[PDB]
């Protein structure tokens, strides 16, 4: 049986991302908004059972859980044409609709209040999964609901499913925009704490990176949250195409991700996308070769993660996995790897063997692809520490400023102190330093 994946969409940002993800998945699999495979979707070559459940022999329902502490977003999802696509038994919605008030401590307390309902939903979804690999959580780290509830959910999943894999799609707050959530660094700190202690892999989705890519690369003057969520859903689709089109390699999510995370702490992944085109530049299908593809991918404009320019640390890639979809000549791939090494287009860790992994994947047969060749890059790159260092600096600035802590003190998790945020900030600082070490040859002796 397929390794089923439960998609959890948490808080306003997480729920928007989940909704757009489900829309993209439905579009890629040719599933009607009711969860029924469209009659044109006769190409049964997609693996829906990894991420979707079959309601009947023909209707695939996403294995997606939409979770919000505010009823407005859940109702808006239920007000879409795709409301019937998801199994309603996998949907847990907080009755109070009041949200967490952008308070991580409130989100955690609400998760505890909905612990029974949430864990009943999780157990019900697990029993509906023949060989469940794990859960995918979509949330924001800056808010209250998606952040606080995300930390609570991660803790309870680790306690309840200690033998199950936990992957997250974690939307990180925009670091270039002034967050109105002054306690977001506290929320971000709690989410990073839970990912460090109870998650095995955290996929960082920086809203700053999404906005930067939409503005500079997509030529979007005012990127909507919806447009960012649709870009994220497209990225997730490209990352899951090899799961939906089974092949010789990377036939499981854990098999795919095992090569990327060498240590439990080294669970910060960078992303890359191909082909990268400006929204206006869709017009010209460039006959890009695997060497040309990799060369465009090696351009920072084509990487699906905007890591800051750390000038002090010689940040390097720890590992790279390229998932390429479409028509690829193997000799061109070989020449691409050869040129990349010869041109030193990527710096790798000096302390161990490192390379750019290349995966070739089929496109979804139910979704017509406008591009002859597409590609995902997954990378572990020390330059992600510059994002992590910036998050740590924001955390320290908030704790030193006690900003918005009075609202967290209203919630029991933060009522007496913000010590969890400070411990999370210290752990994140140690993580940044370790990521800098992993850019260095002394990573061989790191942790000795």
């Amino acid at each position: 049986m397929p390794r089923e994946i439960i998609t959890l969409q948490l808080g306003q940002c997480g729920n928007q991302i989940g909704f757009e993800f489900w829309k993209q998945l439905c579009a890629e699999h040719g599933i009607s908004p009711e969860g029924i495979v469209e009659e044109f979707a006769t190409e049964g070559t997609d693996r829906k059972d990894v991420f979707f459940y079959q309601a009947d022999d023909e209707h695939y329902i996403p294995r997606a859980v939409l979770l919000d502490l505010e009823p407005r977003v859940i109702h808006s999802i239920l007000n879409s044409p795709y409301a019937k696509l998801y199994n309603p038994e996998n949907i847990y919605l907080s009755e109070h609709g009041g949200g967490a008030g952008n308070n991580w401590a409130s989100g955690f307390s609400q998760g505890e209040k909905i612990h029974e309902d949430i864990f009943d939903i999780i157990d019900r979804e697990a029993d509906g999964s023949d060989s469940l690999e794990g859960f995918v959580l979509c949330h924001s780290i800056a808010g209250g609901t998606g952040s606080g509830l995300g930390s609570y959910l991660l803790e309870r999943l680790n306690d309840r499913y200690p033998k199950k894999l936990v992957q997250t799609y974690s939307v990180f707050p925009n670091q270039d925009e002034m967050s109105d959530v002054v306690v977001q660094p506290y929320n971000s700190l709690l989410t990073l704490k839970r990912l460090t202690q109870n998650a095995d892999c955290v996929v960082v989705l920086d809203n700053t990176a999404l906005n930067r890519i939409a503005t500079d690369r997509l030529h979007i003057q005012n990127p909507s949250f919806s447009q960012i969520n649709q870009l994220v859903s497209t990225i997730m689709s490209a990352s899951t195409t090899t799961l939906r089109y089974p092949g010789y390699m990377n036939n499981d999510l854990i098999g795919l991700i095992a090569s990327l995370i060498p240590t439990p702490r080294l669970h910060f992944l960078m992303t890359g996308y191909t082909p990268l085109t400006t929204d206006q530049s869709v017009a010209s299908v460039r006959k890009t070769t695997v060497l040309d593809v990799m060369r465009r991918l090696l351009q920072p404009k084509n990487v699906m993660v905007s890591t800051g320019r750390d000038r002090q640390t010689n940040h390097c890639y720890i590992a790279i996995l390229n998932i390429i979809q479409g028509e690829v000549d193997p000799t061109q791939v070989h020449k691409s790897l050869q040129r990349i090494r010869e041109r030193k287009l990527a710096n790798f860790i000096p302390w161990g063997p490192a390379s750019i992994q290349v995966a070739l994947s089929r496109k979804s047969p139910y979704l017509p692809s406008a591009h002859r060749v597409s590609g995902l890059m997954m990378a572990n790159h020390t330059s992600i520490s510059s994002l992590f260092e910036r998050t740590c600096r924001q955390y320290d600035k908030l704790r030193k400023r006690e900003a918005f802590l009075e609202q967290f003190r209203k919630e029991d998790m933060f009522k007496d102190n913000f010590d969890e945020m400070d411990t999370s900030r210290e752990i994140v600082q140690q993580l940044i330093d370790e990521y800098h070490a992993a850019t260095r040859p002394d990573y061989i002796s790191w942790g000795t």
């Binding site: 020449k335 050869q338 040129r339 090494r341 010869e342 041109r343």
Partner: protein, 60 residues
């Protein structure tokens, strides 16, 4: 002569000999030598044939 030209590209093979084996592609040779300088300065015992072939292909 027609057979040699059409099937074995004898004149084309000679032109290739001129361009490459006779160093006729002087810019290519220059760039190859520039890339090889850090390699060609190294001890020959440290050379990996795969690396040299890759450098040649890259320069081409």
């Amino acid at each position: 002569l027609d057979v040699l030209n059409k099937k074995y590209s004898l004149l084309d093979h000679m032109q290739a000999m001129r361009r490459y084996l006779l160093l006729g592609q002087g810019d290519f040779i220059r760039h190859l030598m520039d890339l090889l300088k850090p390699e060609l300065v190294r001890p020959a015992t440290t050379l990996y044939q795969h690396n040299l072939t890759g450098i040649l292909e890259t320069a081409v």
